[PDB]
Amino acid sequence: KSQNVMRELRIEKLVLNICVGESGDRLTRAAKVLEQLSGQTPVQSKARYTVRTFGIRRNEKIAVHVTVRGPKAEEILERGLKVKEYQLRSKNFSATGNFGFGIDEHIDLGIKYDPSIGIYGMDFYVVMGRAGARVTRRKRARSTIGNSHKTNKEDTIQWFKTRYDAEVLDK
């Protein structure tokens, strides 16, 4: 039955990325912004290799990201959709049923502005999934998800439109 309780779409995780191009104080302030927003200590990502054009070097701490789950993830997601005034594009949805958008200023979310911190843009990505994804993530007896239980673009688009009364453009 397509109308089963366990087939309910719901958010798996929200990942917040700030890819400041350098290392040092600026990256530290982006991490402070992320720890402020999520309430959890974020983690810093190192460059996989060196590019002179981008001014980065291998193992230089470049970006910072954090993963939030549960009600806090829901609150942050709607706080960010308010800034986007609830209007994404069709191209914002991946073939695997996940979606994302990118804000440009972190004070638009609704947090206090500090001259020392400055303003950072931010990247939002939401990982969608039904119940039973633990099959693919548990240690013992890991398996794959059946095709009907898989998350795809159309179901995620319809679920987002229904749950948020928002519009999914396609320009």
Partner: peptide
């Protein structure tokens, strides 16, 4: 605090293929 760990093995990369200009 905490930082991402190297899941990959391209130790002596320092650059990547496919990354060709004019492409």
């Amino acid at each position: 605090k905490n930082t991402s760990s190297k899941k990959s093995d391209a130790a002596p990369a320092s650059a990547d293929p496919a990354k060709a200009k004019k492409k």
